[PDB]
Every structure is written in C-alpha cells, then in structure tokens.
Design an enzyme around this catalytic site. Structure first.
Site, PDB file in Angstrom:
ATOM      1  N   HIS B  41       0.637  -1.359  -0.047  1.00 33.92           N
ATOM      2  CA  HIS B  41      -0.069  -0.100  -0.288  1.00 33.92           C
ATOM      3  C   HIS B  41       0.942   1.191   0.183  1.00 33.92           C
ATOM      4  O   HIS B  41       0.269   2.197   0.094  1.00 33.92           O
ATOM      5  CB  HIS B  41      -0.867   0.166   1.118  1.00 33.92           C
ATOM      6  CG  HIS B  41      -0.419   0.276   2.540  1.00 33.92           C
ATOM      7  ND1 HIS B  41      -0.025  -1.018   3.462  1.00 33.92           N
ATOM      8  CD2 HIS B  41       0.017   1.092   3.354  1.00 33.92           C
ATOM      9  CE1 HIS B  41       0.278  -0.560   4.658  1.00 33.92           C
ATOM     10  NE2 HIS B  41       0.549   0.657   4.428  1.00 33.92           N
ATOM     11  N   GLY B 143       3.429   6.125  10.275  1.00 37.42           N
ATOM     12  CA  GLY B 143       4.694   5.998   9.580  1.00 37.42           C
ATOM     13  C   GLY B 143       5.617   4.599   9.962  1.00 37.42           C
ATOM     14  O   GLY B 143       6.601   4.523   9.644  1.00 37.42           O
ATOM     15  N   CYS B 145       4.316   1.621   9.407  1.00 35.63           N
ATOM     16  CA  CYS B 145       4.282   0.579   8.257  1.00 35.63           C
ATOM     17  C   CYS B 145       5.584   0.275   7.905  1.00 35.63           C
ATOM     18  O   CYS B 145       6.657   0.980   7.693  1.00 35.63           O
ATOM     19  CB  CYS B 145       3.308   1.086   7.149  1.00 35.63           C
ATOM     20  SG  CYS B 145       1.817   1.031   7.995  1.00 35.63           S
TER      21      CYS B 145
END
Ligand SMILES: *[C@@](O)(c1nc2ccccc2o1)[C@H](C[C@@H]1CCNC1=O)NC(=O)[C@H](CC1CCCCC1)NC(=O)[C@@H](NC(=O)OCc1ccccc1)[C@@H](C)OC(C)(C)C
Ligand SMILES: *[C@@](O)(c1nc2ccccc2o1)[C@H](C[C@@H]1CCNC1=O)NC(=O)[C@H](CC1CCCCC1)NC(=O)[C@@H](NC(=O)OCc1ccccc1)[C@@H](C)OC(C)(C)C
Lengths: 306, 306
Positions: B41, B143, B145
């Site tokens: 993503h 942030g 991820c």
C-alpha cells in the site's frame, strides 16, 4: 496506538561487547575506542571474594593475565588501571564500531535499556528503572557481569549502568561506567540487602497519561487535590513524594491531554484508595512505575534515533 | 534471577531498515541483499485506499517513482514486483550489512521482537506475541508501516512479521515477509475487526514454570487434573485448549522444576477459579501469556546469539 515496555535499539551497544577472562573468571566488557571497561572483581578468585583488597590484587597482575576477545578476535592488553569499581584495560586496537557515547550517572526513577550478555555475546534487551533503593529488577544469570545499561539520544549512547552482582532478594546492583556503585553496595561477598523500596510516583502519573493518550480513561474523576494532600496519601501507600519539579516535568503530558497534573493526582489517589476493581490500565492490573514522562512522550510521539 | 520481557538484540535488523517513499507516502522497508521489501500500500494515494486494485496501481508505476533511502544514501530502484501484499524493490546495491536470515510464517501463540521504525530509523524494540486472533498488541504510530518482527537463532534472523495497519481496537495487523496477512485481514480501508481473542494457555503455563524457577511458588497445590478436565475449565475462562503437543513442549520445564505438567494445570485451574487474591507472580497481577516455553528456557538458562 498501543503501549509497550520499549527498549532502545541495541545495535550500537552490541558492537561494543567483548569477553574478558582473567584466571578462572570470565565476564563481559565494554570496548570503546582502545579501552575495555569491566567489573574489577574479574581479578578476584573464588576465595578472594569475601574481603578482597583490589589494590593488592591488581598490583599482582600483568597485562597478559587479561584475555580479551572481541568475537573470534583476540585483543591484546597493553595497560590496565582501576577507577573505583571498574577496571580499564587499554588495548592495542580501537573499536571501529565505537558509537558516539557518553557516561552518565542517572538518578533513581530514571529508566534505561539493558543489553544482557554472556561471554561477550548479547542475549536479550529489556527496559529497567533505577529503583529508589538503587537496585534494578533485572534479569541476569551467572556470567552477565559487565552487561551494561544505556539510553540513546539521536546518535549518542549514554551508558549509565554496568552489572556487578545479584542481591539475596533477586534484584541487582551495579555501577555507573566510572565504577561508582548505585546505592550503598560494595563489591564484596559480605551480607548486603536492598533496602526498602518505594514506588516511583512521577512515573505512575506519566503512565496514567500514557493510558489517556491511548484511550483508557475509566480511572479519571472530577476531583482535584493539593500537592500536600496528595503526598500525605502517597506516604501511606509507600509512594515517593511528588515534588513541584515532578509536576513541572509532567507539564507537556498535561497540556497534550488537557488533564491538570493535580487532577491526575486525584485520580491516582482514588486508584490507591480503591484499587482497580478487576479493571486494567494499558494491559496491567498493577500501577506501573517504570515509564518516565520522557518515555511516554517518546513512545506516544514516535521519536527515532540515528 | 529475575524475569523480564526480553527482546532479541536488534542490531542485525537495524542494519537492514530503509525509507521507501512513493508519491506522498513514506514508510519503512527491509533491505536484504539487493531487494527492499515493504508494504504494497505504499503505492496507494489518499483516495486509492478504500478499494484499491494493486495490479492496476502497480502497472502504472515506474522504478523512478520509488525513492529508497538507506540512511543518508539514495538507493536506485532497478526492478519492482508484487508478491501477495508486499512489494519487492530490486535495487542496484546489495546491503553489505545483510545478516544470515530466513522468512518464516509463525503460528499464533509464538512470540517475536518488533523493531519499531519511522522514516527508516529504528525507534524502539519490544517483544510481542501473535494472538490467537492473528492480531498483535503492538505499539505503532503513523509511519511505522514496514517495521518488522523477528526472532534470532544464534546468527540467523528469522523475519516473521511486517507491519501494515492498525485496527479500531488499537491492535495491529500485518503480514509475513512474503506478504500473506496473518488472519483474515486485507490491505483495504474497509470495515474490519480483530475477532474475539483467547488466552494462550501453553504460554501461561510456561510463565508459571518461569515463576517457580525464579522462586515464586505460592500458587502451587497438591492437586492434579486430567487434560480433559483442565480443558473444560479453560473454555470457561476463554483460554485456548491445551493439547498433548503443548504438554510435550512443556516437558523440559517440567523436568527442571519437578512439577508435572498436569500438576501445573491444576494450579492454573485454581488460579483461574480463585483469582490471585492481591498477590503477584513475577511482578504481574495478571496471568501472563506472551512467553513461550522456549522463551522461558532461553531467559532462565542464558542462551546468546552471534
Ligand atoms: C557476574 O556474572 C560475576 N560472576 C563473577 C565471578 C567472579 C568475579 C566477579 C563476577 O561477576 C555475576 C552475576 C550474578 C550471578 C547471578 N545473577 C547475577 O547477576 N556476579 C556474581 O556472581 C557476584 C560476584 C561477586 C561480586 C562482588 C565481588 C566478589 C564477586 N556475586 C553475587 O552477585 C552474589 N551476591 C552477593 O554476594 O551479595 C552480597 C551478599 C548478600 C547476602 C549474603 C552474602 C553476600 C550472588 C551471586 O549470590 C546470591 C546473593 C546468593 C545470589
Ligand atoms: C502505516 O505507517 C501506513 N501509513 C500508510 C499510508 C499509506 C499507505 C500505507 C500506509 O501504511 C500505518 C500504521 C498505522 C497508523 C497508526 N498505527 C498504525 O499502525 N498504516 C496505516 O495508516 C493504514 C494504511 C492503509 C492500510 C491498508 C491499505 C490502505 C492503507 N491504515 C490503517 O491502519 C487504518 N486501519 C484500517 O483502515 O482498518 C480497517 C478499518 C476498520 C474499521 C473502519 C474502517 C477501516 C487505521 C490508521 O485507522 C484506524 C482504524 C482509525 C486507526
């Protein structure tokens, strides 16, 4: 979201751990530039431990009595000196992995990460606090001496603890990196005990703020309290006194949550007096006191290091 | 002595973290040899999140749309591919810090260390478990991820988790390093929820053994129980069923403590039925279930890594 006991990333310290062997004693040392720091009782034998005179013990040693291994590499000792309870072994090679670093002596209530090591090889990392009685509730086995505790500010490792010994209650005692013990302890095999401990009040309050930042809010109330009247309740439950300096420290967390510090004290008062009644805060059924106000802001805001 | 939530030393993973930037999205990636792994993503925009078709989204990207930074060094992307929910960015430089590593998909109940990262810079390390409902109770902000979870066996990093998303209850969902989600979750901004969770029974028992190894022993009793009758009590308290395989796993801890597994089940039964009554185990007022039998043996025995 979420709140964990979070240690600092340990890589900068891992690159500094070495094995120090003298006689039949092996322990961990900390290799920074061309010096290896380690507990001075590495020079003690099994019968020297009861009441050693480290000055005689050290004046009988040669550099070649110290075997230092950095991984599978054998470091040569070219000088040695004692500073308080740490030994400094000067070696012919500077650690190329030496981080930016400082040696700091922390106050009780402050937290730090411990890199547990055996034979110069790191085993695990966890977060601790300096207890008010100058012990730490660590996790340490035979051979962990010389493992260090540390904090990181961006790129700088602030070393604050070196492990020396375990006390009969299973808690741990050690020094700063200049070899000064935290608390009244001495590096002798003589009867010593921790001293009565107390709960770190300012940290509990920080953790309650962590809970609010994270959505637990069942413990709040409309009440307030004076600092005086709070501290009279804290004494009763063996909590450390809360100072105005503590109140000021808690300012940012107060401002971000909109909960006055003294209002959160009134909530802690009610928690002390009524228990938690089968409820949890941040997944704990105990009032947690090993997070500083700085720890909370760091984890609830996302500060990194490099 | 002592027992802590202990993470693995994080250095080997720290040397692999990088920043991946595509469009207005920045997250963390994992740089191993000449490939950077990150959540797919990263190709999504603010309005692509509701129901993206990642195959169209990716077929519209060029390599130069991906900005990869390893520290203050700008890595060039020379190829990209999607594998399940991870993106693999092939780069012109192999990470010289690549550890020995494996990608493993863990079972629920297994634990791992999380290196939390923002902008490719590690923030903290903590220990987690894969919950039975395939979430993890992490600590993650915007942030994070691409932060990974991992275990270490001597010198080998077994990567088992990459962070993708937070669920409404504040728990976290992600993939293995081949991009397969743990649990039923999907990388869409559509209504999803954790599923009812259960307590990891075998781990609670391991932790009770940790307590005995460490000198807490107030919770033991003379009773025993059958596996069947234990599992009837576990269901009632939302505990995972205990299998014979679980019993076998608990063998070493049983042998070292001299407490038959089923005897410790009888003690857990009594703890479930009577509560703890104002007492603590290993400094917890809750029955702790994020230590595996392996974790206990590791920490109570002193296993290192190198
Ligand atoms: C460390 O790895 C180590 N091992 C050494 C061997 C020789 C010299 C120095 C050494 O340092 C361990 C780490 C310990 C072991 C278990 N958990 C730990 O954290 N440190 C010691 O074993 C240490 C060595 C002595 C330190 C002081 C100078 C002489 C060497 N000993 C202890 O920690 C003992 N504690 C202790 O003696 O406390 C004072 C005391 C209180 C009450 C009665 C008598 C003495 C521990 C190991 O003993 C127990 C209290 C029984 C646990
Ligand atoms: C990660 O840093 C990140 N940020 C991204 C931006 C663009 C693309 C990918 C990104 O990945 C964060 C980490 C999160 C942030 C807070 N704590 C974390 O762990 N991940 C996200 O923000 C993530 C991005 C989307 C993932 C799926 C594909 C599209 C991009 N979003 C979420 O985690 C949200 N969760 C979510 O949508 O769950 C499903 C859902 C349930 C109920 C109603 C609607 C949707 C979070 C951020 O939203 C909340 C649930 C409100 C917390």
């Amino acid at each position: 979201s979420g709140f964990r006991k979070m240690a600092f990333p340990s890589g900068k310290v891992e690159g500094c751990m070495v094995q120090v062997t003298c006689g039949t004693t092996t322990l961990n040392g900390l290799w920074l530039d061309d010096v290896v720091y380690c507990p001075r009782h590495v020079i003690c034998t099994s019968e020297d431990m009861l009441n050693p005179n480290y000055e005689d013990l050290l004046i009988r040693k040669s550099n070649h009595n110290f075997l230092v291994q950095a991984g599978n590499v054998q470091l040569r000792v070219i000088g040695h000196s004692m500073q308080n309870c740490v030994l400094k072994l000067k070696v012919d090679t500077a650690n190329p992995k030496t981080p930016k670093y400082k040696f700091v002596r922390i106050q009780p209530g402050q937290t730090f990460s411990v890199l547990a090591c055996y034979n110069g090889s790191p085993s695990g990392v966890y977060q601790c606090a300096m207890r008010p009685n100058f012990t730490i509730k660590g996790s340490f086995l035979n051979g962990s001496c010389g493992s260090v505790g540390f904090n990181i500010d961006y790129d700088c490792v602030s070393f604050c603890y070196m492990h020396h010994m375990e006390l009969p209650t299973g808690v741990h005692a050690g020094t700063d990196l200049e070899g000064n013990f935290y608390g009244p302890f001495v590096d002798r095999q003589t009867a010593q005990a921790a001293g009565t401990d107390t709960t770190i009040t300012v940290n509990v309050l920080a953790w309650l703020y962590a809970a609010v930042i994270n959505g637990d809010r069942w413990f709040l109330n409309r009440f307030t309290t004076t600092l005086n009247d709070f501290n009279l309740v804290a004494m009763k439950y063996n909590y450390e006194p809360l100072t105005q300096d503590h109140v000021d420290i808690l300012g940012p967390l107060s401002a971000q949550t909109g909960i006055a510090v003294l209002d959160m004290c009134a909530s802690l008062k009610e928690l002390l007096q009524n228990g938690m009644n089968g409820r949890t805060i941040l997944g704990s059924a105990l009032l947690e006191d090993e997070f500083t106000p700085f720890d909370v802001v760091r984890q609830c805001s996302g500060v990194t290091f490099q």
